[PDB]
Design a protein around this ligand. Sequence first.
Ligand SMILES: Cc1cc(/C=C/C#N)cc(C)c1Nc1nc(Nc2ccc(C#N)cc2)nc(OCCCN2CCOCC2)n1
Lengths: 412, 549
Amino acid sequence: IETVPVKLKPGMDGPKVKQWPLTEEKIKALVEICTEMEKEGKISKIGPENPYNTPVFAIKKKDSTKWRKLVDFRELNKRTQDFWEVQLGIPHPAGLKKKKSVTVLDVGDAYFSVPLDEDFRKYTAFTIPSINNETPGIRYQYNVLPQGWKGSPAIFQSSMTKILEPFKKQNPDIVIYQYMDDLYVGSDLEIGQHRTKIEELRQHLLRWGLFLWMGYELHPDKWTVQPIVLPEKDSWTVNDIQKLVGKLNWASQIYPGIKVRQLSKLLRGTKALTEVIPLTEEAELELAENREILKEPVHGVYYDPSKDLIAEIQKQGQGQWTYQIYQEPFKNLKTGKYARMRGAHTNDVKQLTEAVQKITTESIVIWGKTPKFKLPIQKETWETWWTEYWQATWIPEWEFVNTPPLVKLWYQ
Amino acid sequence: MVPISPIETVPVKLKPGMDGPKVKQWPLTEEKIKALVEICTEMEKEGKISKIGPENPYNTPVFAIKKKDSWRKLVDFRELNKRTQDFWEVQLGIPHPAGLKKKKSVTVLDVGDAYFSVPLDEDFRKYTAFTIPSINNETPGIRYQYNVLPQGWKGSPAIFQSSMTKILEPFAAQNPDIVIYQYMDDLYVGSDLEIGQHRTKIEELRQHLLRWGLTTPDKKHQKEPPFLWMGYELHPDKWTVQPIVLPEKDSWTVNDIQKLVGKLNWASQIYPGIKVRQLSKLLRALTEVIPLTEEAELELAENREILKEPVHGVYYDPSKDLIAEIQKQGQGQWTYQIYQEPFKNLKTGKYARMRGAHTNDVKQLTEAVQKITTESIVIWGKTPKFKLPIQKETWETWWTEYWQATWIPEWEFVNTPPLVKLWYQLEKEPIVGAETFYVDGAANRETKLGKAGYVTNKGRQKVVPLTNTTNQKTELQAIYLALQDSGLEVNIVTDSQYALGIIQAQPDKSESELVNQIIEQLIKKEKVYLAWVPAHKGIGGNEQVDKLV
Ligand SMILES: Cc1cc(/C=C/C#N)cc(C)c1Nc1nc(Nc2ccc(C#N)cc2)nc(OCCCN2CCOCC2)n1
């Protein structure tokens, strides 16, 4: 019933981010949605004395025919004070990524029960735009905790903690994690009893006083990892050996004692690319020693919570995508590969967007925050289309790579 | 007295840490002072302003200007504007005629009266204080403050529009058979209603506006179709740009071309086929006369041919489909038309390639499509169906083999040359039977002297010496040599990541004459396999030794 005081960082004014064009279908949904949220006191109309603005649009969650409102609080979030709570900083549950099955819940409606600080409400202003700027946009501001904002989980954390107490004392093995509007619940239980404990939990939430019906089941214990592998051939062409040396030369930036001398000695002379070359003894040994090295982990690879996670993604063709998460170059914390077919067989951008979401979800489970993406796509193509395929309640950061990386085939 | 509804004031504050204006009032002639006093006397009598005591320390300069040698009052609010908070300006982004819908009747009403019915925030009025200097400076000058939104103030246009909108809002929502739009001191109402019903709706609107004490001049407004609005011409059933006149000159300065490009840019939204590159490639000193190239003069001659006759755009019909068609014009220029019915454009437009070192037609096409797509969502709220000069098979080959992710929304092939094609396509695997060329280049950083060349499996060799060059040019030169001296099928091995990065980007055109020559060589080939190896790793073939000298 009482609001917790919220302010911004010293020297920073509220967000003034342009609203980007929305389609007719998304505008109608946002109008229909904001009409009801105003009747529920969740939002209120505002005037021209409010200069602040934050983009907004509409999505459909995983297998649903009902629109969801999504606000891009990325600017407000990096401008709102580093909201430390009475928690002194929650240590990210390192057992979450070890559980057999993790389900992800949407507890966003829970935030709508807690009021927002009056002096801070002006900063959550957003515009429902009109087609062709015919009518003026409809301006609203939030009166409660908004979905997407960084302060919403922090503030509600005091409330959320004592809501799940009867469930946590009863089930002391289940690991529960909260990021933004999503609740991550992992367990070693069988999927059948898992879905019941989940259904028990959402009924335990509905009873306490709070669309929380949709579930997103992961499997961290079955998650993809990638060591560096070299080919095993009975006959090597000059081209085969040339690609091998290239890959080993690159891997030497990562691993210490990688040698290519004996292998290069095979390439001496000017031969045809398709000419078969028999390996010498010293060469097979060198290749053997190099395999050994690659099997061991990378030396000195740690995670620093004070640094940014960076994700790089390569298009491999035929629907496959590789990716690497790191903080330091050649110091990969995580690598992976995709080949999904979720209705994107003829669309690169939809695949990339699902890839970015899948990688972000993984990143939240492992380290408890989102990576800075580096996408193999022109800025203009991505900015035109990513909202049409986005289904996650959060939004990572991203930049764009325009020069073809040579290291594309060394990860395939 | 019929009770009129009050208009909600908007809470206005000054920027944080700042304070109101304290500008000295300029001395005025006895002529001007007399004029201002009379004006401010009736303004006070109308309620627009009020006299204030000596307590107020804020001041804003007020001037008097002869209304074309006939007096007008002018308060200089520049200092207050710099110190006033930011507002949510709503005019940002005017409507585009191609997105509007045809109307049988469009009436105009004057809203000059309702402006002074919008009150200013009580705690902010003190900031609008100004002084009427006294005759001979022998009395304390007359002090006034505003009670309504002052002309010229930063917040006036925003507060006025938001107050007008809030009033018109229930009328618009309950009368969906009409449309209302506001343009500075004037209201525009349009409908497809029977003309009899239309005149009534205007009267209903006037009656509705009366609730807030807002009176229209109760007369048939002189303003009638066509309307001149924001550079456009609005007709009931169509629209166009205000007449574009290309001036005849023997001498064109820098400024004249800017006036020429600007008009061409503005006219390109309805006049199809307008080119501007050869006129924009001259502005790469507004009084400086620049010689017009023969290639640019031929473009201007084509411009006058298109601007020969007036062309009109139609309005948007939500019940029909939306179609965008693109054509390549050359020199990185693209033009497009958007229509619903054949030969009846809603609007037109053009796209120019971004400034880069290298590029190809497929990339530019994609960029044009995205631009049109973004524009079309702004204007119509949906994506048009595309007609593109590129074969389906060409697009499939391109995007399934391109390192970046790319996408074009629903589209069909239209066969109107020049068609967009892929000119060359590198192999994925080495070519059996084809001669293998190991190439390399090197250059002395100081003397700028360098060498380029190759060696092959068949024993073929070449090394050429080069002057005034760099490591990057000699690496490219080496590949060009291999292309020149090889058959229709060839394997090329290089250690240059720079050269590979360029050819993997697949340009069909470039700034560098070197790269262009390579492209012309690639085009002539049947099969080309490019392979990369690391340098200095003792990989035989990779003959740095022939270039190290
Ligand atoms: C921007 C604008 C400028 C001016 C004048 C400026 C000056 N000076 C006047 C108006 C009224 C508007 N606003 C507007 N104008 C149109 N059309 C239109 C056509 C011709 C002319 C002329 N001549 C003028 C306007 N259409 C819409 O919205 C489409 C709704 C579709 N309807 C809804 C009802 O059921 C049926 C479908 N809004």
